[PDB]
Design a protein around this ligand. Structure first.
Ligand SMILES: C=C1C2=C(C[C@@]1(C)C/C=C/C(C)=C/C(=O)O)C(C)(C)CCC2
Ligand SMILES: C=C1C2=C(C[C@@]1(C)C/C=C/C(C)=C/C(=O)O)C(C)(C)CCC2
Ligand SMILES: C=C1C2=C(C[C@@]1(C)C/C=C/C(C)=C/C(=O)O)C(C)(C)CCC2
Lengths: 137, 137, 137
């Protein structure tokens, strides 16, 4: 496997629908959709240790985590949560998220490495799944 | 008293009117209004020493200050200023702001802790006062 | 010469046209145009060593470089590039940019100090030149 690399997006579906579900307002959703159009994803994997940077021209996020070990990050909409990543399999990690404070839709995300040079990111907010596909830059 | 805690907003009035006064353009005002809708305020008080973080999905500000002692921050619209906070009373601090460079409307802000679990933030730009009320998250 | 100082803008032309050329989408272009309206440029020069901070209420960039020595920054649109600055003359430095990864329009920027208290910034994206003029704040 090895997720390491710079990734660029090629396909995306249900991203706005996912934001609507998380109650992001129309103005913020418009900015998010425009910015998520050309992100730059940098991933660094050394064993079960990952570093994932996701840059856009308006908002950038960086996560550091070790698989199977709980850590703190934020939901797509900017809410702080407790996250635990695990290997569903050799090439697919799954992440369950739990909100530190407040109520909200149930969220998670998965990252998978295909055998043909793609990285698939799925993000779920209750019953809405956004799928984004990337290739090495 | 003790301002410490995570606060969420419940009421707000005259925020856009305040921005208009500070000459913020319509596009920026629209983004500001959309982002200020659900901020996350983190406050840490240890004596007369405060740390106030105000996060939104687009722009986040952090201030560190000791009451009665001049420090450097920015106006709501992003202009650098010299600020001095003082206790108007036991539960209310007042902040006078003076622009480092340039001319502009006279600005200030006050934070007050009520006896019923609310934090009140007022922000003034000349004769416009924006009032925002928060409760513990 | 000596570029050091805080600069405010007085004139600007072709900024949106330049962004269109770089393929920035309409939403991002609208936000960029609104934010670039009142930036705050801080420049620090100690010999051939420069530090240029450009703040706006939405996005801020900082570059550190030594003239004639290659360094890493980003294009106006947020793309990482290898940059080498050189003195075209006593009061004018020129910067050629080369994209780390991917294809794109040919970009560069120049900064010039006039004899009447202005700083001129030109930015080029292929055959579009944006000119921005500043004065000391
Ligand atoms: C500019 C963005 C904004 C948001 C999310 C983001 C970051 C766009 C998302 C990009 C992704 C998810 C890229 C990727 O992973 O390919 C919010 C919803 C908080 C709203 C504020 C602006
Ligand atoms: C996104 C924001 C923007 C601005 C202010 C802010 C930060 C919204 C303010 C939130 C507040 C005041 C929250 C609170 O204190 O509850 C500016 C005017 C610079 C314009 C650019 C975007
Ligand atoms: C808010 C800005 C945005 C952009 C550029 C910038 C930074 C506006 C530029 C200001 C300049 C060039 C100021 C100056 O130098 O006077 C992008 C195109 C990435 C799009 C996202 C928002």
């Amino acid at each position: 496997p090895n997720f390491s690399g710079n990734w660029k997006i090629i396909r995306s579906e249900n991203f706005e629908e996912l934001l609507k579900v998380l109650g992001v307002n129309v103005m913020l959703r418009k900015i998010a959709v425009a910015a998520a159009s050309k992100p730059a994803v940098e991933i660094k994997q050394e064993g079960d240790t990952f570093y994932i940077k996701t840059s856009t021209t308006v908002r950038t996020t960086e996560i550091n985590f070790k698989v199977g070990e709980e850590f703190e990050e934020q939901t797509v909409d900017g809410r702080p949560c407790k996250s635990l990543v695990k290997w569903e399999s050799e090439n697919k990690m799954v992440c369950e998220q739990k909100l530190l404070k407040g109520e909200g839709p149930k969220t998670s995300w998965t990252r998978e490495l295909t055998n043909d040079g793609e990285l698939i990111l799925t993000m779920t907010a209750d019953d809405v799944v956004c799928t984004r596909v990337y290739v090495r830059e």
